[PDB]
Design a protein around this nucleic acid. Structure first.
Lengths: 74, 50, 64, 95
RNA sequence: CCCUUUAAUGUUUGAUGUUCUAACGUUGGCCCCUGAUCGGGGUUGCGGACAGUGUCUGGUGGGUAGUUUGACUGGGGCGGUCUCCUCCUAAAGAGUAACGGAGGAGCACGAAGGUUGGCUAAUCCUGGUCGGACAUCAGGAGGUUAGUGCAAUGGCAUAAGCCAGCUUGACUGCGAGCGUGACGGCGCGAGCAGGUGCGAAAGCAGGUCAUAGUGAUCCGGUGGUUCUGAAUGGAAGGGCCA
RNA sequence: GAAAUUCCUUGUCGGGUAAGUUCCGACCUGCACGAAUGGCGUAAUGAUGGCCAGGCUGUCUCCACCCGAGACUCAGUGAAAUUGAACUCGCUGUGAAGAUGCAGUGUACCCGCGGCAAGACGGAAAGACCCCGUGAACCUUUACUAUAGCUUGACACUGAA
RNA sequence: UGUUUAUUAAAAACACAGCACUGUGCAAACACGAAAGUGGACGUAUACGGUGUGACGCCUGCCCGGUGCCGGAAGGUUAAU
RNA sequence: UGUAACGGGGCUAAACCAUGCACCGAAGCUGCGGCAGCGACGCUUAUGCGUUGUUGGGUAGGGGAGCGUUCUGUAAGCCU
RNA sequence: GAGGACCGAACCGACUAAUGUUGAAAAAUUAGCGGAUGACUUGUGGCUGGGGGUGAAAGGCCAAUCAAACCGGGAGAUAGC
RNA sequence: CUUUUGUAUAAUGGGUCAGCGACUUAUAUUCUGUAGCAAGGUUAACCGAAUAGGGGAGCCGAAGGGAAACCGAGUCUUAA
RNA sequence: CCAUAGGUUAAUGAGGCGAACCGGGGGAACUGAAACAUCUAAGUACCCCGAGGAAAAGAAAUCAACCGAGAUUCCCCCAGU
């Protein structure tokens, strides 16, 4: 009655903290947010955060809900 | 699936058409939209929801 | 005897200047209403044959 | 091109284009060949007398590919914008 | 005097029966070749444009003939499965098998898209025109236990949820850069160009909360395109674009 | 009608036997008989299938003896399958999982002859079964595609009124 | 009675006389044969071919939906032309 | 099938536990001699050869070197 | 004096058992067994030819070969074994 | 030896010897080595006193983008 | 009845064999396609007919491209286009 699964979507973090990225570089692929778009980072339609600017990757909890953001710092 | 393919044809006289879908049994109104025509580079009315 | 070109390959590929092969993209024949216009826009330029496929193509096209 | 029985790459991909039948009768004349035409007059028929183009060619183009040195006279051919600026830079007249 | 029609004597064309004989049949008699039941010729008789053969054609045709009749599989068969999505297995990056454990998809939507301006639930208590546990109204609690067109998971209050206003950006050409695949491919994308929508200003939009909703090539079809156009001018066909 | 057919089934009842999964007679609850892919009988017939009885006997209890042909010894002639090589024991264990050969340990002078058939996974035949191969053949049909044949009409041969 | 798997099966199988159905008008149907021709047969429906059943005795029920065959051709569809 | 559940003999320690020391033990390591690959060396002055470092189990497989056989030239030459 | 009558030799077969199974024999011997005036049996000629024949039907037989004989050719078929 | 995850295997093959017995050949293509000549390099058939010489028909290379027309060190894409 | 058919007698000529090549009439399948039917193999194998030292083809209803070429045959390219 079972037997079906799907192809694995290769989600997760592609560039970790302190990594230097070019602009347009995908930083995290995700389904929901689970990671919000901080400075110099777009959200994308499937919520794929991506570097809007060259610089280093920066994760930080910030906000009234302790949500993880991702900034980009040149 | 049970939505047919229609052929949005421009008003600018050029042969440029868009194609899209439509619930034919729900909506029998001829869908008309002001879309872009690359042959004339203006927004014109597209018609004829097949 | 001479090597016979795979003639169905000689219509899919053309050899370029540095030695590789250009080819039309697949997935742009029919069933296009459902395809996005961005996706159909990127299949319109000719692409270069990949690394792993190139040994299969020069086998097919010896007089390219 | 066998892949196992997977659809092969030369059948996975679309055929495109056509053969021109006018690209078979055209050739390009480098500027290196403007000194070998034996007379200083580059016709179509004098490029064949020096075995530059080919006997079945009806159209030749003179392109900027190297060192026109002499007074030359291109008659009845096409030249590019670089080759026209080099033939006249050595003292040549194009008809 | 050149018309459509309304029905005719002279009259073309298509069948129908009768009739005829003159092709054709004769495996009827007789004669001859020839004191040869073959054959041929002759002469009568009967049949007769039929029958029968040819070419084309429809049907019928295991009478023959060429072949096809899948893989997985805790041996094969039978059963079930085969592509895609979500979770777990999966070992805190990615990936990861089994006829492992559970579910779903093969769409929908011209609004359920864009934008702009608002808004904030489920349940419960109480009050009580019918009205009951629950219709509606009013307050209190509660704080998302709701809702997300459709599974499950990640999300969602700046709401991605809910309501109206106006609308077509569900644009055309591109695209730095990446992610992901053996590849074919698939995905994300700021920005630029051209035009456009929304703001009674500023301030966004290249479809939908995201992830399933799909099919390579070939061969054609349909529009477009003054790209080719087998002496030339055209055309046909091909290409390219949709 | 539990049958050349009845799965359950050695149905059940009767007969036959000291005792009868067979037989014979029935019963009918015919898994899943049946009327010319004939149904029920049926004298005769059968190197036919099954069952019983009398005779008969070495079939047997349970074998004994005898007569010839080999076997056996001598003389003459003189094969065969097989065969990696052998200085070719038992046991227990190990081990590609059933050991003459490994380990450990028992035992065992060297070499024939007649016997026997437990092992040498003994000899024989690239398993016939079972899988597999996009093997083959032949057979079937409402598989597919054809085709001979048969059949239809048009034109031809082929005309007149 | 007979026949049969020469060489593991001799039988309950096959054949059979009989029975029925069906085709067949004679240039017979059939069969062999691209054909001519020849078997059928120097026969002719009391004859021949094909099928099934299988002496004899008593018998042969019901079903024409399916599938064939046979008959009909008004309509519907339908080839070459 | 025969002890057949220390490999056996045998063992009251020749068994366990703790500690300690010695020794045995491999194709490992070291010594001695040899050979080869790779480098670094200008060590040489085509660069051989030297100097040092380190490496040399191998199926499929890849790479690099050879041996020998018959035949042709060198060959009316050399051996016989 | 009939009879696919009976018994039983030749003859034609081949039911049972033993032997044989590198045999005396690539199917036989030995002891029994069935038919034996007939759908018998046999000699000598003939005729039917391989997707063909012939078949009292076994896939039987067609030269110790038969679910498509043999010989030569395609041909060094092809062989993911 | 073969085949294998794995064989003394009781899996395969071989009684033994001797002789024969299996990666070739033609042509095309690509790459490495090497040699000649280099922006050029080479001829094929044929002729030929024949491995000479002649024969440059051709072939490949020096230019590419584009489906193509075309343009050309750029060109396609696209109104750009 | 003419006259044919026939009949006779002459002269001529033919047939048969032969290895390959050659022209014509017929014409496979295995194989390849990783199955297979279009296609392939291949107008090959083969079978037949006929001929010559060669045969066949052959003197433009041919090509070319606005210039031109000038019967057939064979070879090298064109071009694995």
């Amino acid at each position: 009655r079972n037997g079906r699964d799907s192809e694995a979507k290769r989600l997760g973090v592609k560039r970790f903290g302190g990594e230097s990225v070019l602009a347009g570089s995908i930083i995290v692929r995700q389904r929901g947010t689970k990671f919000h778009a901080g400075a110099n980072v777009g959200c994308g339609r499937d919520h794929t955060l991506f570097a809007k600017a060259d610089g280093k990757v920066k994760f930080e909890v910030k906000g009234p809900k302790n949500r993880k953001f991702i900034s980009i710092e040149a | 699936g049970i939505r047919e393919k229609i052929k949005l044809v421009s008003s600018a006289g050029t042969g440029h058409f868009y194609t899209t879908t439509k619930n034919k049994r729900t909506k029998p109104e001829k869908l008309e939209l002001k879309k872009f025509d690359p042959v004339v580079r203006q927004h014109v009315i597209y018609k004829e929801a097949k | 005897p001479k090597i016979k070109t795979v003639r169905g390959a000689a219509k899919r590929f053309k050899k370029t200047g540095k030695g590789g092969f250009k080819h039309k993209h697949a997935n742009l024949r029919h069933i296009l209403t459902k395809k996005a216009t961005k996706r159909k826009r990127h299949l319109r330029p000719k692409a270069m044959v990949s690394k792993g496929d190139l040994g299969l193509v020069i086998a097919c096209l010896p007089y390219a | 091109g066998f892949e196992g029985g997977q659809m092969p790459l030369y059948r996975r991909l679309p055929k495109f284009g056509f053969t021109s039948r006018k690209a078979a009768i055209t050739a390009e004349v480098r500027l290196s060949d403007l000194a070998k035409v034996e007379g200083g007059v580059v016709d179509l028929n004098t490029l064949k007398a020096a075995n530059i183009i080919g006997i079945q060619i009806e159209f030749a183009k003179v392109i900027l590919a190297g060192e026109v040195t002499t007074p030359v006279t291109v008659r009845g051919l096409r030249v590019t914008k670089g080759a026209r600026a080099a033939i006249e830079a050595a003292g040549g007249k194009i008809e």
